[PDB]
Amino acid sequence: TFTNPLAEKRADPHIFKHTDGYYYFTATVPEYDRIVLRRATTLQGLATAPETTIWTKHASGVMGAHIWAPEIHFIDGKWYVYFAAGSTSDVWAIRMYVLESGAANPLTGSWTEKGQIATPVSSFSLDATTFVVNGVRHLAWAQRNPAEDNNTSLFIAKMANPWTISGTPTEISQPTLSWETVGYKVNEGPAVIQHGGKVFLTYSASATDANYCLGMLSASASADLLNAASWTKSSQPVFKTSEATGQYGPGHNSFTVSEDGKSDILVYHDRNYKDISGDPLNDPNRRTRLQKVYWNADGTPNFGIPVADGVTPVRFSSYNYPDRYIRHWDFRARIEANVTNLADSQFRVVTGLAGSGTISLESANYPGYYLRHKNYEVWVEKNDGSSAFKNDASFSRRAGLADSADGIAFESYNYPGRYLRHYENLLRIQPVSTALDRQDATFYAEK
Ligand SMILES: [Cl-]
Ligand code: NA
Numbered sequence: 001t002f003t004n005p006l007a008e009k010r011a012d013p014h015i016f017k018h019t020d021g022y023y024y025f026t027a028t029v030p031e032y033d034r035i036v037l038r039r040a041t042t043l044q045g046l047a048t049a050p051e052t053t054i055w056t057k058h059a060s061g062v063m064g065a066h067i068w069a070p071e072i073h074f075i076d077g078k079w080y081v082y083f084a085a086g087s088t089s090d091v092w093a094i095r096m097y098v099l100e101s102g103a104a105n106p107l108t109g110s111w112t113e114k115g116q117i118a119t120p121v122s123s124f125s126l127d128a129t130t131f132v133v134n135g136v137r138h139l140a141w142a143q144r145n146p147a148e149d150n151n152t153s154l155f156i157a158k159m160a161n162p163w164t165i166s167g168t169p170t171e172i173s174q175p176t177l178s179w180e181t182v183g184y185k186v187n188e189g190p191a192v193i194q195h196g197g198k199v200f201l202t203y204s205a206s207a208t209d210a211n212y213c214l215g216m217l218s219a220s221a222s223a224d225l226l227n228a229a230s231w232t233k234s235s236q237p238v239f240k241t242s243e244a245t246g247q248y249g250p251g252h253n254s255f256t257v258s259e260d261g262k263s264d265i266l267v268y269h270d271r272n273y274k275d276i277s278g279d280p281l282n283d284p285n286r287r288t289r290l291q292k293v294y295w296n297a298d299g300t301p302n303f304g305i306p307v308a309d310g311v312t313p314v315r316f317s318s319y320n321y322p323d324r325y326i327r328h329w330d331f332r333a334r335i336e337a338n339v340t341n342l343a344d345s346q347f348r349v350v351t352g353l354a355g356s357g358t359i360s361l362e363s364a365n366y367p368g369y370y371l372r373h374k375n376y377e378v379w380v381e382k383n384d385g386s387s388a389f390k391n392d393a394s395f396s397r398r399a400g401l402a403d404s405a406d407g408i409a410f411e412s413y414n415y416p417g418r419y420l421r422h423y424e425n426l427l428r429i430q431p432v433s434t435a436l437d438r439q440d441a442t443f444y445a446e447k
Contacts, residue, residue: 001312001348002290006047011269011286012069012189015046015256019074023256024106025049026070026081030284033057035070035083035099037107042259043290052107055099057085062116063097064088069127069189071254072106073162075137079106080162082117084126096128096141098163114163119143124152129254130159131192133199133221139165140172140201142188150175150185154203154217156225170226173217175205179237180215183207187215189252193264196299197221201231202238204251208286210274212249214239214303239268239303244365247306248274255293264293270306297338304342305365313346313364318422319402319442326371326427326443328363333371333378333427347371349445353383354394354413361395361410371420371427373412378420378427395420401438409441 007013010027017023022039025046029036034056038049058064065086073080081099086092096117103109117128117139124144131138137159142152153174157165175185189204201217216238223230241248253268269286276283291312294302307313316326324335327345339345343365352358353370361371369380372393383389391414400407401419410420418429421441432441 001314002044003047003311004289004291004307004309005287006043006290007288009284009286010288012252013267013269013288014069014071014254015043015265015267016072016074017256020104024072025288026072027288028067028069030282032066032068034067035081037072039107043256043265054081054106054109055111058088060088062087062095063113065091066094068094069252071129073130075130075162078102078162079109080114080130081111082128082130084128092124094124094126096125098128100162117141117163117165119155119165119169121146126152127189129190129192130162131194133192133194133225137162138225140190140192142190142203143169145171145174148174150181152186152188154187154190154201158226167226170228172201172228172231173203173215173233177205177215177233177235179211179213179240180205182211183209191254193255193293193301194221195264195295195301198299199223199225200301202253204253205237208249208251208280209276210241210248210271212251212270213237213241214251214253214268216301218300238301239266239306241274242305242365243274245306245308245367246272247308248272250289250306258292264295264301266291266293266303268306272309294342296340302340302342304346307346307364308348308367311348311350313343313348313362314445315345316347316408316443316445317447318440319400319407319444320436320439321422322444322447324422324425328380331369331380333380334425335422335427336425349397352394352413353390355390356413358394358413359397360393373415373429376415376418376429378429400442400444401432402435402442403444406444407442408445409443 012028036051038051040046040049063085068084070083079101098114101109127142155169157169160166216234217231219230250270323337325345346364347361363369370393394413395410398409412418419441
């Protein structure tokens with residue numbers, strides 16, 4: 001699990017996992033004047049890692065204003081930082097720029113400016129990211145198509161080197177959909193994740209207010225990624241505001257990976273309030289958050305909802321039906337496979353309500369509702385403050401009954417000897433007797 005937020009007053013987060021045993025984290029700071037960097041051996045270490053300023057805006061001319069959205073990459077023996085910048089003489093003439101370092105440690109290393117990423121059309125440009133598909137390097141970025149009445153569209157090009165595209169850009173998405181064009185017509189912040197023979201390119205859309213959200217384009221890893229018709233745009237956001245979790249305008253994301261290389265991690269910013277006061281560029285409250293990406297059975301990513309602050313939620317799968325997860329539906333708890341509404345199946349383990357070192361399981365999509373029993377049947381229901389509820393929603397965490405080493409089992413606090421178990425797919429608390437009952441009452445957290 002992670003503890004959110006990772007970093008206050010840090011927007012447009014980018015985390016790179018290097019081969020040297022470190023994660024590197026850069027981001028947009030509210031001053032918009034410089035490029036910070038911090039490293040840690042773990043993703044959670046990043047919360048306390050000290051920032052170093054690797055580069056500061058120029059006093060005059062290009063790269064002199066609006067230092068926005070850096071990414072750090074290690075490529076062909078060297079470090080590259082991609083950022084966007086305006087000029088002192090013109091603060092909205094935002095272009096894409098590249099830094100290069102040959103030093104082993106990018107925190108202490110020395111940086112050379114590779115200048116502007118050239119593009120045939122000279123217009124508003126930012127959010128350059130780079131990725132390799134099938135051994136071929138690409139750049140994707142946000143830029144104004146002057147023949148469109150909007151802010152930015154999405155472009156992709158192959159690269160000749162880390163700071164230079166080859167051939168011509170293809171525009172692969174423009175903001176047309178109702179949810180893309182709130183306040184401003186925007187497609188920005190592209191980020192690529194590849195999985196199961198597919199390439200997913202999430203992007204940010206609408207204004208950076210509560211209306212900020214993620215769209216997604218999908219393609220085949222075998223497709224020509226410069227042919228616009230290779231890509232399919234998702235009709236609805238893949239990640240948006242959750243009032244229920246107090247998370248507003250989630251977006252400008254990137255992707256990294258868990259400590260074991262096994263889990264994909266979504267990195268992004270949001271706000272914990274809806275309406276900004278003052279000039280939105282000047283509101284510094286955007287913060288950096290982490291949560292695991294889960295993969296759907298059809299191999300698409302499932303981002304769920306942006307989760308409540310504090311520790312991240314978990315999913316529990318059945319011992320005897322390892323495809324099936326504890327989830328709620330019409331607030332009844334059950335086990336089910338291939339959960340489309342991902343958050344119906346996330347719960348965080350918290351200090352038990354009833355006390356004495358027990359545990360409770362809070363719903364991720366309905367904070368302050370808990371898995372609790374009533375008449376021995378298990379539901380998800382609002383903590384009403386009563387002692388009854390405290391007791392129906394607390395369990396003693398036991399070693400799994402069919403798996404003592406790695407499994408987990410939930411013994412009722414107010415009905416000791418009754419365990420959480422599935423029967424006919426529905427969750428109950430019932431006494432456990434047969435070997436099969438012991439499997440019905442064993443579960444795995446995060447496998
Ligand atoms: Cl579902
Ligand atoms: Na980015």
